[PDB]
Structure formats: C-alpha cells, structure tokens
Amino acid sequence: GMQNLKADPEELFTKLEKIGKGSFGEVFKGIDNRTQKVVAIKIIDLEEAEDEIEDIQQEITVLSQCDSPYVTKYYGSYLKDTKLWIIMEYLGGGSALDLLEPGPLDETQIATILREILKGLDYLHSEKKIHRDIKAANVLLSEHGEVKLADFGVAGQLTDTQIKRNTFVGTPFWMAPEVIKQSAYDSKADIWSLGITAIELARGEPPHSELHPMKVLFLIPKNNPPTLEGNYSKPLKEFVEACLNKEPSFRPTAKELLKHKFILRNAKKTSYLTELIDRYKRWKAEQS
Numbered sequence: 001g002m003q004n005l006k007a008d009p010e011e012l013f014t015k016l017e018k019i020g021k022g023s024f025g026e027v028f029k030g031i032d033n034r035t036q037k038v039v040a041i042k043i044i045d046l047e048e049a050e051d052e053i054e055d056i057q058q059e060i061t062v063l064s065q066c067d068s069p070y071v072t073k074y075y076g077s078y079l080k081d082t083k084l085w086i087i088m089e090y091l092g093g094g095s096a097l098d099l100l101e102p103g104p105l106d107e108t109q110i111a112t113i114l115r116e117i118l119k120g121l122d123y124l125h126s127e128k129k130i131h132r133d134i135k136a137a138n139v140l141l142s143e144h145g146e147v148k149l150a151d152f153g154v155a156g157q158l159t160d161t162q163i164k165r166n167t168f169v170g171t172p173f174w175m176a177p178e179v180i181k182q183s184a185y186d187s188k189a190d191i192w193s194l195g196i197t198a199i200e201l202a203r204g205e206p207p208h209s210e211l212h213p214m215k216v217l218f219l220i221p222k223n224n225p226p227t228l229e230g231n232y233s234k235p236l237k238e239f240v241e242a243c244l245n246k247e248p249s250f251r252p253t254a255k256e257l258l259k260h261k262f263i264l265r266n267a268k269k270t271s272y273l274t275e276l277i278d279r280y281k282r283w284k285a286e287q288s
C-alpha cells in the first residue's frame with residue numbers, strides 16, 4: 001500500500017490559512033519549519049470522504065513516484081488523527097485558467113505555457129503515467145512563471161500487465177472520445193486533452209463550454225473533432241488539429257509536439273509569464 005506514510009506533521013510544518021478547495025478536501029498555505037519555504041497542504045477528512053479513498057491512495061502513490069520540475073513537487077503524506085495531510089510545493093502564480101480571466105493571451109504566451117505542459121506530459125508518459133485531467137485549471141504557475149502539472153487525483157498508471165486503461169475519468173469538455181466510450185486507452189488521451197487545452201488557452205474556453213456536460217458526452221464521440229476557429233496563426237491551428245484526431249494512434253506524442261512549428265516559432269522564456277501573473281493580481285485586486 002503506502003509504505004512511506006508519515007506522522008506528526010505539525011512538528012515539521014506550520015498550517016496557515018485556507019487557500020482553496022481540492023474537491024477531496026481543503027487546501028491550506030503552510031510553512032516548512034526547516035527551510036521556511038511555503039508549502040501547500042491538502043487536508044482530507046478520512047472519516048468523511050469514504051469511497052474516494054481508493055482515489056486518495058491513487059493520488060498519493062502517483063505523486064510519490066514523480067520527480068520532475070514540470071510536476072508539482074510532493075513532500076509527503078502525513079497521518080494526523082482522522083486527517084491525512086498531503087503536503088506539496090506551493091505555487092503562487094495561480095492557475096493557467098486564472099491567468100485567462102482578465103483577457104486573452106497572445107500566441108507567445110500560449111506557446112510558452114503549452115511547451116511546459118508538454119515537458120510535463122513527456123515526463124509522465126515516459127513513466128507510463130497518464131494524467132487524465134489535463135485542463136488550464138490543473139496547470140499551476142510559480143510567482144515567477146514556472147509551469148507545472150497539478151491535481152493527480154485521477155492519474156492512471158500503466159504496467160507490463162496493464163498496457164491500457166478504460167476508466168471513465170476526467171472533465172467532460174476535455175475528455176478524449178475513447179475515454180468517454182471507455183475503450184482501452186493510454187497516454188494519447190492526454191494528447192486529446194492537451195488539444196482542448198490549447199483551444200482553451202487561445203479562446204478562453206473549451207469547445208461546447210456553454211452546454212450541459214452530459215450533452216457533450218454524446219457530442220464528443222459523435223461530432224468531428226473541434227478545430228481552432230478565428231484569426232490565429234496557421235501553426236497554432238495545425239497544432240490543435242494534430243492533437244484532436246479521433247483516432248488515438250494518429251495523435252503525436254508529447255515528445256513530437258515539442259518539435260512542432262507552433263512551439264518552436266513562438267515559445268519564449270517562462271519568466272516572461274510574470275507579466276500574466278501580474279495582470280491577474282492587478283485584475284483580481286480591482287475586481288468588485
């Protein structure tokens with residue numbers, strides 16, 4: 001099971017104020033009392049959240065096996081009475097979805113964000129892991145513009161005896177057709193979700209965003225794949241099209257997409273993304 005579970009978290013960390021909800025539990029800011037670095041603490045009431053427990057175990061397992069600058073760093077899991085503390089690196093720049101709220105991105109920002117997402121997917125997929133919930137809300141940034149994949153709550157693991165998954169998980173607007181159909185699928189599902197995320201970064205919202213999620217559960221397998229419509233560069237449109245193939249084996253790998261024209265021509269230093277982070281802080285501060 002979970003061999004490296006720890007105890008007595010408050011000997012090592014200080015729990016500070018609530019900073020969000022992780023659907024499983026609450027998320028708190030915290031301090032590593034050893035380094036004085038800020039951490040993010042997700043507290044899960046084990047007494048309450050009873051059948052997502054197998055998902056909790058899954059999230060912990062996957063995280064404890066990841067070591068990448070492009071994946072939210074995992075400190076450890078701590079048992080404390082009826083509570084499980086999952087302690088991770090704090091990322092202060094908000095999510096990519098947050099950064100969209102004040103207005104449109106330009107294609108340099110879109111490419112920069114996508115390139116780092118792609119480095120994350122390359123890492124995960126090389127580790128036979130599948131994120132299965134790629135969307136802007138699960139892409140978090142440090143206050144200086146580093147970009148990491150977050151929320152491994154439904155991440156899947158492939159093995160020598162299980163080469164495909166088939167579980168119905170993810171977020172409907174971003175889900176690949178084969179996942180909705182619960183066919184046998186793999187990392188190529190993440191590549192479809194990446195394509196929807198590209199549209200989301202460009203347009204602000206995924207295709208079908210105004211419809212009830214249950215509707216899209218039939219629309220996505222039925223309809224032709226979405227395309228990126230509007231006045232965007234040809235390489236961006238082709239990048240999206242490449243990802244959004246109904247046939248999974250025809251989608252490129254993350255490795256391959258890192259050499260796409262759109263990425264090569266437009267991605268720049270992640271530090272430039274602090275402009276976006278500042279735009280959000282400004283916007284959020286004057287929001288009524």
Ligand SMILES: CN1CCN(CCOc2cc(OC3CCOCC3)c3c(Nc4c(Cl)ccc5c4OCO5)ncnc3c2)CC1
Nearest residue numbers: 019020021027040041042086088089090091092094150151
């Ligand atoms: C103007 N600003 C307001 C302050 N803000 C800081 C952003 O704060 C976070 C919030 C987190 O919680 C998430 C809840 C789900 O949506 C995304 C935000 C962070 C986070 N969450 C987290 C997730 Cl998603 C999954 C497992 C976890 C987690 O914490 C420990 O275990 N992780 C890291 N940093 C967070 C910072 C800036 C803008």
